[PDB]
Design a protein around this ligand. Structure first.
Ligand SMILES: CCCCCCCCCCCCCCCCCC(=O)OC[C@H](COP(=O)([O-])OCC(O)COP(=O)([O-])OC[C@@H](COC(=O)CCCCCCCCCCCCCCCCC)OC(=O)CCCCCCCCCCCCCCCCC)OC(=O)CCCCCCCCCCCCCCCCC
Ligand SMILES: CCCCCCCCCCCCCCCCCC(=O)OC[C@H](COP(=O)([O-])OCC(O)COP(=O)([O-])OC[C@@H](COC(=O)CCCCCCCCCCCCCCCCC)OC(=O)CCCCCCCCCCCCCCCCC)OC(=O)CCCCCCCCCCCCCCCCC
Ligand SMILES: CCCCCCCCCCCCCCCCC[C@@H](O)O[C@H](CO[C@H](O)CCCCCCCCCCCCCCC)COP(=O)(O)OCC[N+](C)(C)C
Ligand SMILES: CCCCCCCCCCCCCCCCC[C@@H](O)O[C@H](CO[C@H](O)CCCCCCCCCCCCCCC)COP(=O)(O)OCC[N+](C)(C)C
Lengths: 54, 55, 273, 54, 52, 54, 55, 54
């Protein structure tokens, strides 16, 4: 709600300092880490002669 | 979920540190009781109105 | 420089400048359970290089070493150490406990309370007898309107039921259509885009609903909203005075609340509210 | 919630009479009607050869 | 989320216009308290005033 | 809920004036804007031979 | 009983409010040291849940 | 919430004794049972010349 039981107004909502930066500074590096993990796992699956797409 | 995990972390860190949580709770409830009593005592002492019952 | 006093979390604190150790020493002290004497003792124990210390009133008469600190923080004062005299002005504070001398108004309100205690029994005794009459009066004024309201809300319920079962029938016939298309006429690689865009269109309609009606699309809430709309649009085809009905219901509820609040102090002999 | 603040048990939940029968009696016929109008629309599109499965 | 955004916009406008929100909130709470104990004095059950 | 603490009927819900018009006057224009944006961007990627639909 | 209550309730409520202030000022003073341990525990209990959310 | 109406802390959340073990002792065996059901139904369907993939 925007007002209390009387006509008073609720305080300003707390906003995190540097929100988008702290989010995109932890999303992108882990996308890269996931890319690396998947590439290495596919390479190892192809190495052990297990799964070769054709 | 965040509140449940925070509570589990708090109740583990308080056991590791041997913090008297029981005394803390029973001491924070008595301050609340005495302030509700002070809030009740405002009617018959400032505005000369009958005291409000418990609840 | 000078001395300051601040209340934090209900406790006063005073920042004193000390001669022997030129450092702003803070003292957190309780106003009720301490006196000026213990404050001077704290000062002497902290410094142990001050020859003497005393507090004076704003006029010059020395204040006793036994007055509580709450009695002191009302008005300004002077704090004299062996060489310096700081005029300390406490923060503006009006009242402490509402405990002071007697006043004729107190006697007047006491006499009023005595008269109230003497007459409130016979007052409430027939106020209950008048409330129980007004309640029946209001209840007999409402009997002709209740059946009309029932006949209106029965049609409102019947239309809300039609709407609910129609929504179910629609989301069944959509399933039927898509199941016939994906396995008999066309293939699934043709019907997958259609069936994803149907999902996205539904997810967009559920948001346009919120944009338009200012509330989230939840089943029992949209149902209650459509029931209220059907009811209020069915009260126009009958010229139903909803203002009178609401006024009567509120008055009956208030009368019953007054009776319930009043009759218990007459049974167990306790205060009223 | 199960009990009232005083301790008493909440009343028995209301149950619609023959709900599991009404639900299927509404689901089945409209599902068949949907299949019917889908077949008919596909055949009407095929007649004029507006869209053919190719 | 709509309420949160509305509160942020309202408080940014209030800071841009120097509205002095604290006095307004205090006055609202004091009106909510002054008319509560006034209808408590005109109580139809307790005989606090003449003309009953 | 449809009634207050007492048996009184809640007021009719506030209804936005011309809701479907104000909705379909902002859904259709932007849907066409998106269509033309995709068309132009795909023709641009086709002219420079970066991604070709085969 | 009601008359006697009326005659001697303002002085009793004044003594009660004085005792309540003297008791609240002691309860808060007794609670003062435990707040430090509580905050030192809640910071460690909140760091690990911010770690959990970010993870 | 993490505090009561006063400053007191909520009691510790009541955990289930061996919860993860008790859930993975139900998920896996029924998973294998469903696998068996699917295998037997597919075999029954293909044996009677009803549905053959290729
Ligand atoms: C396969 C082809 C097509 C398939 C479709 C098949 C259709 C079948 C189902 C038909 C659906 C019908 C609609 C019903 C919906 C609900 C009905 C309802 O609420 O009630 C309406 C109505 C009244 O209720 P109400 O409270 O008054 O309504 C008022 C309000 O406005 C109150 O408003 P509100 O604020 O409370 O909120 C409501 C609001 C809530 O808001 C919405 O519904 C949001 C809608 C926004 C849509 C967003 C866009 C979606 C994006 C899709 C994009 C598609 C692009 C495609 C092309 C691109 C390429 C792929 O919606 C509306 O009110 C609007 C009407 C509802 C329409 C449903 C919308 C669904 C989305 C579909 C649109 C998309 C179409 C695109 C397809 C094109 C394809 C090329 O019912 C009646 O009471 C009828 C009364 C009849 C008049 C006379 C009275 C008496 C008559 C009785 C005679 C018999 C008695 C005999 C006499 C006996 C006595 C003696
Ligand atoms: C019918 C008469 C009713 C009239 C009045 C009632 C009479 C009062 C009797 C007084 C009390 C009697 C005392 C009972 C004595 C004993 C008490 C006791 O110990 O237990 C009773 C005790 C409770 O009895 P109760 O006191 O009457 O209260 C329960 C009421 O049912 C709860 O009712 P409610 O109102 O609170 O709301 C519940 C409502 C909730 O509404 C619904 O659940 C929806 C209703 C049906 C769906 C509607 C549309 C679905 C869309 C389908 C699409 C269309 C077709 C598609 C075709 C496409 C082709 C083109 O209905 C149900 O929950 C019905 C049960 C349905 C749940 C089963 C869901 C599992 C699905 C499995 C199928 C999977 C297939 C897909 C996979 C395919 C490919 C792999 O029984 C229970 O265990 C109830 C809990 C739920 C258990 C559900 C399953 C248990 C098994 C039952 C069936 C047995 C045969 C199946 C064998 C299959 C094995 C492989
Ligand atoms: C007896 C049979 C005769 C039939 C003729 C009667 C004519 C009546 C008119 C038909 C009215 C159609 C009503 C359609 C509403 C039901 C469709 C909806 O329930 O299904 C949803 C799919 O449909 C889409 O959501 C479209 C919704 C359209 C937005 C509102 C338009 C109509 C609202 C107007 C009032 C309707 C009140 C009915 C409330 C149930 C489920 O999607 P799902 O992912 O699982 O839900 C997400 C979880 N939620 C629900 C909690 C959010
Ligand atoms: C809740 C709402 C959900 C909506 C779901 C929408 C899903 C519907 C999907 C239907 C898609 C069909 C369109 C596919 C057409 C592509 C064919 C392609 O070749 O484009 C052609 C080029 C035709 O262009 P068009 O503009 O269509 O010409 C119309 C011809 N007329 C005028 C004779 C009708």
């Amino acid at each position: 709600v925007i007002v209390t039981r009387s006509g008073a107004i609720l305080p300003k909502p707390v906003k995190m300092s540097f929100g988008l930066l702290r989010v995109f500074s932890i999303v992108i590096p882990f996308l890269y880490v996931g890319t690396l993990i998947s590439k290495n796992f596919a390479a190892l699956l192809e190495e052990h002669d297990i799964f070769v797409p054709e | 979920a965040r509140d449940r995990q925070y509570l589990l972390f708090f109740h583990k860190g308080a056991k590791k540190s041997r913090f008297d949580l029981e005394k803390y709770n029973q001491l924070k409830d008595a301050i609340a009781q005495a302030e509700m009593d002070l809030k009740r005592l405002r009617d018959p002492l400032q505005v000369h109105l009958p005291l409000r019952q418990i609840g | 420089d000078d001395v300051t006093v601040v209340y934090q979390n209900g406790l006063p604190v005073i920042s004193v400048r000390l001669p022997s150790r030129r450092e702003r020493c803070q003292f957190t002290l309780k106003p009720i359970s301490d006196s000026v004497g213990v404050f001077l003792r704290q000062l002497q124990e902290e410094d142990r290089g001050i020859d003497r210390v005393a507090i004076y009133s704003p006029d010059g008469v020395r204040v006793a070493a036994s007055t509580g600190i709450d009695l002191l923080l009302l008005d300004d004062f002077k704090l004299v150490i062996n060489d310096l005299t700081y005029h300390v002005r406490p923060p503006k504070r009006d009242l402490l406990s509402h405990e002071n001398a007697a006043t004729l108004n107190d006697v007047k309100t006491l006499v009023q309370q005595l008269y109230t205690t003497l007459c409130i029994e016979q007052h409430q005794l027939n106020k209950e007898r008048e409330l129980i009459e007004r309640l029946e009066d209001l209840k007999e004024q409402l009997a002709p309107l209740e059946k009309v309201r029932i006949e209106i809300s029965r049609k409102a319920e019947k239309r809300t039921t039609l709407v609910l079962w129609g929504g179910l029938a629609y989301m069944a016939t959509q399933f039927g259509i898509l199941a016939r298309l994906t396995w008999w006429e066309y293939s699934w690689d043709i019907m997958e885009p259609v069936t994803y865009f149907i999902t996205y269109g539904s997810a967009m309609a559920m948001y346009a609903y919120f944009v338009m009606t200012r509330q989230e699309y939840v089943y029992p809430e949209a149902r209650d909203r459509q029931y209220l709309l059907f009811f209020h649009k069915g009260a126009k085809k009958s010229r139903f005075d909803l203002e009178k009905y609401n006024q009567l219901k509120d008055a009956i509820a208030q009368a019953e609340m007054d009776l319930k609040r009043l009759r218990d102090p007459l049974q167990v002999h306790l205060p009223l509210r």
